[PDB]
């Protein structure tokens, strides 16, 4: 006679073993996999399947007033300048106009809040240095202010005039530059910047495409949606800046 | 490629932020200093550190333990300091070598071990309170404290809960670099090869999972750094192209996907699971299973290979064959 | 079929090879040249596995084991039933793993994002090559590889480790273990933190980046930051295999005694000997 | 620090189990040469004359051989145990039958041991058998002996450092570690398993579920037994210069049959053979050797696996004199 034996040669272990897969599959399929559907669902074309797969909308009580509740239905009835390359269901779309300006493909932005991202206090989070005057480029890093911006065509495009700092974390998120010969200032995310000792190289877009970088509303603050629009613009460059960038690398 | 993912090209400095808690804002001590090199891959600011009651208690108990170990170790090389620094790794405070069951063993045989055990338990608990309440004080969920509980439990299991269940202190983990490592094998050997304990597998499954997940999740966020994917809270409360592109990556690759919030739940779960699984296995071992290998043989899962060198009969059960 | 927001991203382009030819989806799945080659390899592989398992002694998923050839065969081709299947299946898994990684690249290109994922995926693929190719090459025989079998591969790990008396003392292993542990812990904290901030509960208010950092500064004096934890994560986890590979590649080709003994360089410095 | 490739590998288990030896050609060759200094057997002198049990005064054990034969054995006995010291090492140069010097009484005790080994423990030594050389390797004191406490260096033909000297207290853990392949196993496998036969090696349960009445509290073997067996297996492994896969398929240390190599059985008999060697022959000699040869508790020096194997799986790589000196075994 042994410890952990149960009638008809089942042992405690063997049970706990089934119990464990049960617990794991519950949590995976019933809980986690449902949570995964709090965004983007339900798919675009009231069947049984679709009620079963979502969870009960949770509600976020926002820090600076309001609520957001997910999942919720969010129809993208923004215009899309895309035509189809073929008949079949799985075929790709493609831009009819200027993808970068039309905001399609790798160049698309989300319908984020037309709001300004705030600090724990209220002041706008992403502000240029001319406002956040108590913030500095740190002890011994390149100060890009004044340096030329050089686009993918190796042609000069503008001049860096300001850095925009996230105030909540202490982190620089964009450079603000001046589009040479357009009487306009443009933002570029530091992700797209090779920051040298004597210049800033950007390979996302060609120089003369700096012209059309989405413009901000106020000039000393930026909206969550504007941040996407801007980020998205340069991203679009990777694939669209020339006819050859959409093609195959090898 | 986005250099910003590799290191931070241009650091920024500003006044140090403080978020006010519901208590002990007065216990934060320290002169928050910065660090250029730390800033290239992290946040430059170090400190200030929050004290608090529980935090101090942890250090009290913790060092009592460390002292009790370190002293038994210095004793083990007869208090000669040069040998102690040389043989460090090999030195240990061990549990009772003889079978005293659940009775308090003599100091010369696992008495001190049981002592340091207790103080480390005390230390661990204290530190939990700190981890727990800090979340409370700042108005945050207690996910971290719950997860950390799993880890502490597992330590209690291999520490004393198991020894208790089989009723012998000899079964606990020795304090010491090599000695605690040796235990792993003495324990696996004793219970019939841990490769064959299913919970060992579950725990390993999840631990590799965390490897897979963090590797994947982290890579994902960096790949969408250009859209501020890093700004996770707001991507949660206001989905943006960053997590849209993240999601569509995975969806186009593996056929499904998560949400910037949900993934952290996967992550959190997998972590939690490593310790829960570990604990479940240890609980069963000795109590309800004696040889994990034979147990898998009993349920017909263990594989078998043909002989290569000739098979070799236990000579101990030959006719003839001495003691 | 598409996610609420997916339609706009579904443009043509990004491929490494082929162009428009395989540039399309099938369900949620992106195909591409490498999705095609990937499928071809997965099909051969699972076939070879399934078919070779059938000359096996059992159908129990836990006991099925398909093993490499005997040492004597060296680096040459082995008869199917004596590790030939194993060799084929190994070539298939490598073709698949690579297709899969290259495919992920095309996907990141269409999406205009970082290649950080396929890149990180090279770590796991690399370590697999260390185990089934590089070390085997260094010791002169495919026979040194691990067998394909749910439990049986553990048997190999077991024996491989005891071939060195106590694999725990392998310094490359000590490293790798520690990364494994710490990474699992980091994923706990990071995943936990975000959740602790978006989900304070009681219908309290969602908190701030400031709160994130505040939390750790308090508990341990430091806080690495949001974009930073993500990098640290990729690093910790990648190192499980990046350092571990040395411990593996070293056992045999560069060291033939128990690992404990290797610590003689320390224990036996004549100074304190 | 890091031995360069290639490495000689052998296969001891079914393909795909990573069972087998892993060897450094350099280190093998070095031992092959140290082990090659086994003196060749003397040319054979034919059987003529009368049994020496009358022709000599004090010949207890070897009394069946002619004087032609008996002298040849004494020539070999000399090469093996003291080729430096001549015959006069055990004898008096005039009084050859004199048990004057103690190496005489002992060498006899050894003669029976050798003969017992090659006759009874053929399950271990088989066709190879031992001679005085196997252990002595050209010196009265064999290089690898053990006392009732761990000692260093393992080869006594080297000068101990201060900390190696058994009197140094702080040097303990390291004397212990080096007996156990450098592990930190707080156990001395020799006194525990090899001196006598008090302890049982096996520690793993033979059934899948815990047997009632030996699985709870004060009725259980402590976990420490497992540690200690692990120590013996470290030690043994090192003594033959081999790894666990030489004998075990790690999938289950506890199982024989297909899970064990034939060398595992051989090793099993070896453990018994050592216990006999030690308890009945070597340990008693403490009442016949200089107090200087004894240990810190008057123990005579004794044998572990190393004593014969000295780092090789078969001692002297299998070299045998069994046919050349049949007076040593097996006794017909
Ligand atoms: C050097 C040491 C190694 C090791 C040591 C090891 C241990 C010690 C253990 C495992 C375990 C596991 N290993 Mg093994 N392993 C496995 C696969 C696996 C799983 C059977 C299981 C859980 C792993 C997991 O959850 O990861 C995280 C990934 C997750 C959670 C995503 C899901 C992946 C899915 C679970 C894996 C699917 C495996 C398929 C059954 C096999 C492939 C199917 C074929 C038909 C295509 C693969 C595919 C490989 C490859 C390709 O190299 C591999 C290599 C290795 N393992 C190394 C040789 N592994 C555990 C086990 O219980 O095995 C029985 C266990 O304890
Ligand atoms: C030959 C013996 C072996 C063995 C023996 C073994 C045992 C006996 C156990 C494991 C366990 C586990 N093993 Mg296994 N193992 C594992 C992986 C795993 C882990 C996933 C898992 C959990 C242990 C852990 O995470 O501790 C790390 C985490 C810990 C220790 C929690 C500590 C957190 C703590 C709260 C923090 C406190 C720190 C304080 C600051 C310290 C201060 C103290 C001061 C005051 C003194 C792998 C991948 C392999 C491979 C690839 O071979 C393997 C092979 C082996 N294991 C061999 C088969 N292993 C455990 C398990 O799950 O069994 C089912 C277990 O019990
Ligand atoms: C007695 C023998 C032991 C042993 C033997 C051992 C060896 C021999 C090795 C390790 C190694 C390692 N061990 Mg160790 N070990 C470890 C942990 C670790 C791992 C971190 C590490 C590398 C794992 C690996 O090789 O993944 C490999 C996994 C891979 C390559 C996965 C491949 C991914 C692939 C590209 C994708 C898979 C595709 C799927 C088929 C897809 C399936 C389709 C489905 C899912 C849709 C722990 C925590 C412990 C504990 C707690 O005791 C332990 C004890 C032991 N190990 C024992 C002492 N261990 C390795 C190491 O680095 O040592 C230094 C190694 O070689
Ligand atoms: C899969 C999920 C896992 C997981 C989970 C989690 N793990 C957590 C948490 C969660 C969630 C936390 O929330 C908590 C934490 O804090 O996160 C920041 C924590 C913890 N994980 C630690 C270590 C760890 N986790 C391991 C394992 C896993 N964890 C697994 C993998 C391992 C392994 C495996 O080895 C290790 C070693 C610590 C960092 C921390 C405990 C602090 C403590 O308990 O301190 C104890 C108290 C002490 C005082 C000890 C410190 C003493 C020093 C030497 C100071 C004394 C010297 C003094 C200054 C000199 C005085 C001089 C004077 C005379 C003038
Ligand atoms: C250090 C960093 C690590 C890391 C990181 C990352 N990990 C990734 C990625 C990244 C970044 C991806 O991007 C990619 C992915 O998309 O994720 C969702 C992926 C993936 N990680 C898998 C398994 C996995 N990761 C492990 C470990 C780590 N992950 C470490 C920790 C481990 C173990 C055991 O440790 C496992 C088992 C798959 C789920 C998936 C491959 C899909 C595939 O490859 O499709 C193509 C191939 C198949 C679908 C099956 C192959 C069919 C072949 C021909 C026949 C099979 C033969 C096989 C050899 C037999 C196995 C025997 C077995 C019993 C022993
Ligand atoms: C006869 C035979 C067998 C051969 C046929 C083979 C066969 C299957 C072919 C099918 C033919 C088809 C349909 C056509 C071809 C189309 C094609 C190329 C598709 C290939 C199909 C295929 C092989 C599918 C397999 C997919 C597969 C490898 C899935 C494995 C998934 C697993 C287990 C991974 C574990 C990772 C894991 C735990 C993730 C859970 C959470 C997730 C989803 C994290 C991902 C994720 C992370 C990590 C974020 O950080 C994140 C951040 C912000 C937003 C979102 C996310 C996010 O989604
Ligand atoms: C092992 C140490 C040892 C050495 C070396 C040794 N002897 Fe002996 N000798 C003995 C022992 C022991 C005996 C007892 C034989 C017996 O009891 O069977 C013995 C017996 C003898 C006897 C018989 C004594 C008698 O008359 O009763 C002779 C003669 C002899 N040895 C000659 C030699 C010669 C010649 C050599 C050198 C070639 C030699 N011995 C070297 C130990 C030794
Ligand atoms: C199984 C290993 C082994 C074998 C085989 C062996 N010896 Fe010994 N011998 C020992 C040990 C152990 C001692 C005790 C330690 C010591 O005194 O050196 C010893 C002691 C001796 C001594 C005394 C050494 C001294 O100066 O204190 C002599 C002489 C001797 N043996 C002769 C022989 C002869 C002759 C043979 C062949 C019959 C032989 N030995 C075979 C292991 C062995
Ligand atoms: C030289 C052959 C040999 C080698 C090498 C060897 N073993 Fe053993 N092992 C044996 C024999 C024989 C026994 C049985 C002893 C007995 O029962 O008297 C045994 C017993 C064991 C046991 C006890 C199993 C039970 O039935 O309770 C374990 C565990 C073990 N060995 C592990 C190891 C480890 C770990 C190593 C590597 C450090 C190793 N062995 C190397 C021959 C060997
Ligand atoms: C009396 C000297 C002596 C002692 C002591 C000794 N051995 Fe042996 N060993 C031998 C001889 C002689 C052989 C014969 C080798 C052969 O068969 O070719 C051998 C063979 C072996 C073999 C078989 C090697 C092979 O490749 O087949 C193993 C395994 C072994 N010994 C293990 C041990 C272990 C374990 C111990 C300690 C318990 C030990 N030996 C102690 C003399 C000894
Ligand atoms: C009735 C009462 C008295 C009995 C019950 C008391 C009780 C609950 C006992 C249980 C005790 C427990 C849980 C013991 C568990 C101990 C365990 C798991 C120890 C495991 C590993 C310990 C190790 C590796 C410690 C090594 C220590 C040293 C090298 C010296 C200490 C110095 C350090 C810097 C600590 C290392 C910290 C690390 C980050 C490197
Ligand atoms: C969400 O972002 C995170 C941080 O910054 C805000 C951290 O400091 C930390 C903790 C930092 C260290 C060094 C443990 C974690 C785990 C994290 O996830
Ligand atoms: C051994 C550890 C267990 C980990 C479980 C692995 C989780 C993978 C979940 C995939 C879910 C598949 N799907 C699309 C149906 O959700
Ligand atoms: Fe994250």
Biggest β-sheet: strands ordered side by side in the sheet of chain C? 1-2
For the secondary structure, the number of strands of chain C is: 2
CATH topology of the largest domain in chain B: Photosynthetic Reaction Center, subunit M, domain 1
CATH class of the largest domain in chain B: Mainly Alpha
Binding site for heme 2 (chain D): 110, 132, 135-136
Lipidation (S-diacylglycerol cysteine) (chain D): 1
Subunit structure (chain D): Component of the photosynthetic reaction center composed of protein subunits L (PufL), M (PufM), H (PuhA) and cytochrome C (PufC).
Organism (chain D): Blastochloris viridis
Question: What would you say this structure looks like, in words?
Answer:
- The complex is a heterotetramer of chains A (250), B (323), C (273) and D (332).
- Chain A has 250 residues and is of the alpha+beta class.
- Chain A has two domains: 2-111, Photosynthetic Reaction Center, Chain H, domain 1, CATH 4.10.540; 112-250, Photosynthetic Reaction Center, subunit H, domain 2 (Photosynthetic Reaction Center, Chain H, domain 2, Alpha-Beta Complex).
- Chain A is 20% helix and 22% strand.
- Chain A is built from four helices and 14 strands.
- In chain A, strands 7, 9, 10, 11, 12, 13 and 14 form a seven-stranded mixed β-sheet that branches.
- Chain C is mainly alpha-helical.
- Chain C contains ten helices and two strands.
- A two-stranded antiparallel ribbon of chain C has the order 1-2.
- In chain C, helix 1 runs antiparallel to helix 2 (84-110) and helix 4 runs parallel beside helix 8 (226-250).
- Chain C is flat.
- Chain C starts with 24 loop residues before the first strand and ends in a 6-residue tail after the last helix.
- The relative contact order of chain C is 0.10.
- By secondary structure, chain D is mainly alpha-helical.
- Chain D has two domains: 24-142 and 314-332, Orthogonal Bundle (Photosynthetic Reaction Center, subunit C, domain 2), CATH 1.10.468; 143-205 and 221-313, Photosynthetic Reaction Center, subunit C, domain 2 (Orthogonal Bundle), CATH 1.10.468.10.
- In chain D, helix 4 (102-120) packs antiparallel against helix 9.
- The radius of gyration of chain D is 22 Å and the shape is globular.
- The chains are: A alpha+beta (250), B mainly alpha (323), C mainly alpha (273), D mainly alpha (332).
- Chains in contact: A-B, A-C, A-D, B-C, B-D, C-D.
- At the B-C interface, strand 3, helix 3, helix 4, helix 5 and helix 6 of B face strand 2, helix 2, helix 3, helix 5 and helix 6 of C.
- The complex binds bacteriochlorophyll B (3 copies), bacteriopheophytin B (2 copies), menaquinone-9, heme C (4 copies), 15-cis-1,2-dihydroneurosporene (NS5), ubiquinone-1 and 2 more.
């Amino acid at each position: 006679m042994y410890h952990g034996a149960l009638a008809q040669h089942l042992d405690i272990a063997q049970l706990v073993w089934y119990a464990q897969w049960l617990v794991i599959w519950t949590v995976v399929l019933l809980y986690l996999r449902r949570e995964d559907r709090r965004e983007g669902y339900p798919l675009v074309e009231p069947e049984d399947g679709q009620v079963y797969e979502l969870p009960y909308p949770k509600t976020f009580v926002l820090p600076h007033g309001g609520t957001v509740t997910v999942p919720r239905r969010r129809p993208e009835t923004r215009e899309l300048k895309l035509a189809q390359t073929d008949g079949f269901e799985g075929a790709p779309l493609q831009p009819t106009g200027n993808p970068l300006v039309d905001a399609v493909g790798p160049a698309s932005y989300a319908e984020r809040a037309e709001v300004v991202d705030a600090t724990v206090d209220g002041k706008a989070k992403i502000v240029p240095l001319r406002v956040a005057t108590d913030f500095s480029i740190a002890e011994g890093d390149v100060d890009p202010r004044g340096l030329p911006v050089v686009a993918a065509d190796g042609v000069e495009a503008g001049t860096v005039t300001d850095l925009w700092v996230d105030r909540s974390e202490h982190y620089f998120r964009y450079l603000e530059l001046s589009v040479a010969g357009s009487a306009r200032t443009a933002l570029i995310p530091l992700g797209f910047c090779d920051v040298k000792k004597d210049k800033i190289v950007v390979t996302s877009i060609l120089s003369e495409q700096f012209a059309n970088v989405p413009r901000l509303q106020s000039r000393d603050q930026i909206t969550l949606r504007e941040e996407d629009k801007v980020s998205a613009y340069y991203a679009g460059g990777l694939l669209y800046a020339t006819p050859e960038r959409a093609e195959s690398l090898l | 490629a986005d250099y910003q993912t590799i290191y931070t090209q241009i650091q920024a400095r500003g006044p140090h932020i403080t978020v006010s808690g519901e208590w002990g804002d007065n216990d934060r001590v320290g002169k928050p200093f910065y660090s250029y090199w730390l800033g290239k891959i992290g946040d430059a600011q170090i400190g200030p550190i929050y004290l608090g009651a529980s935090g101090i208690a942890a250090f009290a108990f913790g060092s009592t333990a460390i002292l009790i170990i370190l002293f038994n170790m210095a004793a083990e090389v007869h208090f000669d300091p040069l040998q102690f620094f040389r043989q460090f790794f090999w030195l240990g405070l061990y549990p009772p070598k003889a079978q005293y069951g659940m009775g308090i063993p003599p100091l010369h045989d696992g008495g001190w071990w049981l002592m340091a055990g207790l103080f480390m338990t005390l230390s661990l608990g204290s530190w939990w309170i700190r981890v727990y309440s800090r979340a409370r004080a700042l108005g945050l969920g207690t996910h971290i404290a719950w997860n950390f509980a799993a880890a502490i439990f597992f330590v209690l299991c291999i520490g004393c809960i198991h020894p208790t269940l089989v009723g012998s202190w000899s079964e606990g983990v020795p304090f010491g670099i090599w000695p605690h490592i040796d235990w792993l094998t003495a324990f696996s050997i004793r219970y019939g090869n841990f490769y064959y304990c299913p919970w060992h597998g579950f725990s390993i499954g999840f631990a590799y999972g965390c490897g897979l997940l963090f590797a994947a999740h982290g890579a994902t966020i960096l790949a969408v750094a250009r859209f501020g994917g890093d700004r996770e809270i707001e991507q949660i409360t206001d989905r943006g192209t960053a997590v849209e592109r993240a999601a569509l990556f995975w969806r186009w690759t593996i056929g499904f996907n998560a949400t910037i919030e949900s993934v952290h739940r996967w992550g959190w779960f997998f972590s939690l699971m490593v310790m829960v699984s570990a604990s479940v296995g240890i609980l069963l071992t000795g109590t309800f299973v004696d040889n994990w290998y034979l147990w898998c043989v009993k349920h017909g899962a263990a594989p078998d290979y043909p002989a290569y060198l000739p098979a070799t009969p236990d000579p101990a059960s030959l006719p003839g064959a001495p003691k | 079929a598409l996610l609420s927001f997916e339609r706009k991203y579904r443009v043509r382009g990004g491929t490494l090879i082929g162009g428009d030819l395989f540039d399309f989806w099938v369900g949620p799945y992106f195909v591409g040249f490498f999705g095609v080659s990937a499928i071809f390899f997965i099909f051969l592989g699972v076939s070879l596995i399934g078919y070779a398992a059938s000359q096996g002694p059992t159908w129990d998923p836990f006991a099925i084991s398909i093993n490499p050839p005997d040492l004597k065969y060296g680096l040459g081709a082995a008869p199917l039933l004596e590790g030939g299947f194993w060799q084929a299946i190994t070539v298939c898994a490598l073709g698949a793993f690579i297709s899969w990684m290259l495919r992920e690249v095309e996907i990141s290109r269409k999406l205009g994002i970082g290649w950080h994922v396929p890149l990180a995926f090279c770590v796991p693929i690399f370590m697999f090559c260390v185990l089934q190719v590089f070390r085997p090459l260094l010791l002169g025989s495919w026979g040194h590889a691990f067998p394909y079998g749910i439990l049986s591969h553990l048997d190999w790990v077991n024996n491989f480790g005891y071939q060195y008396l106590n694999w725990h003392y392998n310094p490359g292993h000590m490293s790798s273990v520690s990364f494994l542990f710490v990474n699992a812990m980091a994923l706990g904290l990071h995943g936990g933190l975000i959740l602790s901030v978006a989900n304070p509960g009681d219908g309290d208010k969602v908190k701030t980046a400031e709160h994130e950092n505040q939390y750790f500064r308090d508990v341990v004096g430091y806080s690495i930051g949001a974009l930073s934890i993500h990098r640290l994560g990729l690093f910790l986890a990648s190192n499980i295999f990046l350092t571990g590979a040395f411990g593996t590649i070293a056992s045999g080709p560069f060291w033939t005694r128990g690992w404990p003994e290797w610590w003689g360089w320390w224990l036996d410095i004549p100074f304190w000997s | 620090c890091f031995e360069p490739p290639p490495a000689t590998t052998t296969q001891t288990g079914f393909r795909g189990l990573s069972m087998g030896e892993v060897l450094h050609p350099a280190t093998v060759k070095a031992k092959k040469e140290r082990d090659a200094q086994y003196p060749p057997a003397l040319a054979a002198v034919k059987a003529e004359g009368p049994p020496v049990s009358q022709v000599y005064k004090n010949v207890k054990v070897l009394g069946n051989l002619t004087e032609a034969e008996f002298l040849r054995t004494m020539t070999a006995i000399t090469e093996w145990v003291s080729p430096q010291e001549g015959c006069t090492y055990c004898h008096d140069e005039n009084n050859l039958a004199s048990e004057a010097k103690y190496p005489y009484v002992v060498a006899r005790r050894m003669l029976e041991m050798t003969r017992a080994i090659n006759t009874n423990w053929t399950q271990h030594v088989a066709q190879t058998g031992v001679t005085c050389y196997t252990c002595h390797r050209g010196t009265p004191l064999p290089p690898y002996v053990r006392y009732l406490e761990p000692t260093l260096p393992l080869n006594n033909r080297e000068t101990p450092t201060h900390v190696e000297r058994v009197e140094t207290r702080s040097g303990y853990v390291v004397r212990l570690a080096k007996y156990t392949a450098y592990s930190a196993l707080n156990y001395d496998p020799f006194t525990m398993f090899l001196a006598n036969d008090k302890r049982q090696v096996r520690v793993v349960p033979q059934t899948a579920l815990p047997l009632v009445g030996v699985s709870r509290g004060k009725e259980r073997r402590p976990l420490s037994d497992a540690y200690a067996t692990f120590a013996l297996m470290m030690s043994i492994s090192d003594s033959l210069g081999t790894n666990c896969t030489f004998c075990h398929n790690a999938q289950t240390f506890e199982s024989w049959g297909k899970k064990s190599t034939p060398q595992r059985a051989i090793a099993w008999w070896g453990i018994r053979m050592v216990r006999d060697l030690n308890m009945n022959y070597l340990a008693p000699l403490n009442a016949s050797l200089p107090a200087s040869r004894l240990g810190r508790q008057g123990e005579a020096p004794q044998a572990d696996c190393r004593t014969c194997h000295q780092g090789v799986t078969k001692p002297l790589f299998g070299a045998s004199r069994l046919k050349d000196y049949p007076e040593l075994g097996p006794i017909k």
